[PDB]
Design a protein around this ligand. Structure first.
Ligand SMILES: Nc1ncnc2c1ncn2[C@@H]1O[C@H](CSCC[C@H](N)C(=O)O)[C@@H](O)[C@H]1O
Ligand SMILES: [Cl-]
Length: 216
């Protein structure tokens, strides 16, 4: 029974007020976290349990409370959760840090736009991060996705929120918003599909995309 958080359209009316006052860290300190599902994203649980996510090294940018990081972690899928908020990662570690999966994941306080480890990622899963950033950061987001992926890596975007609302975060997006920043830098969409596991407040407001680099 997970229909307990506001629609993206409702979140967009107030979230900016705290982000503008004290950043994402203030949101986390004050428990103003209306994007947070309180559990792993149902689509992610489904894809993990049907072996429909690639194995290897995975990155979850703007991971927040880290639910999806932990759901994706396994002996063959090492997952890095990246967030700039100390309080977000404190909460993630408080919740999940003692999981037997702890040797297979790491919560790392780093900025997606600038952090570059020596070992890159087979997989990046972006959900509620592309829409969190200021709209003008979007071409830089695309270049960061390119740079953080190995040459045969895959970017998986749960593209959200596909809505008509004004303001943000979360800022409205559509498939063309992703295509416009990803294609010119050498990604190609493998497919774009509905998410039949969308929670009610997000049903019809998100689509799953898989992106690969056109040149190896
Ligand atoms: N440059 C950056 N690098 C890493 N994390 C960032 C960031 N800018 C914002 N964030 C983080 O992005 C998160 C957006 S909220 C979404 C959290 C998570 N994706 C979820 O679905 O629940 C916040 O936790 C915020 O601290
Ligand atoms: Cl579109």
């Amino acid at each position: 029974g997970g229909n307990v958080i506001p629609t993206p359209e409702e979140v967009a009316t107030f979230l900016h007020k705290t982000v503008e006052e004290g950043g994402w860290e203030k949101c986390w300190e004050e428990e103003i976290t209306p994007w947070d599902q309180g559990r792993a994203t149902p689509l992610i649980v489904h894809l993990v349990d049907t072996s429909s996510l690639p194995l290897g090294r995975a990155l979850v940018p703007g991971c927040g409370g880290g639910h999806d990081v932990v759901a994706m972690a396994s002996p063959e899928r090492f997952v890095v959760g990246l967030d700039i908020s100390e309080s977000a990662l404190a909460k993630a570690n408080e919740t999940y840090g003692s999981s037997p999966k702890a040797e297979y994941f790491s919560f790392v306080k780093e900025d997606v736009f600038t952090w570059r480890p020596t070992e890159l990622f087979d997989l990046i899963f972006d959900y509620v991060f592309f829409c969190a950033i200021e709209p003008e950061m979007r071409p830089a987001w695309a270049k960061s996705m390119y740079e953080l992926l190995k040459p045969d890596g895959e970017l998986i975007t749960l593209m959200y929120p596909i809505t008509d609302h004004v303001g943000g975060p979360p800022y409205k997006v559509d498939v063309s918003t992703f295509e416009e920043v990803l294609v010119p830098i050498g990604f190609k969409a493998v497919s774009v599909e509905e998410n039949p596991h969308a929670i009610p407040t997000r049903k019809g407001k998100e689509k799953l995309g898989r992106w690969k680099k056109i040149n190896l």
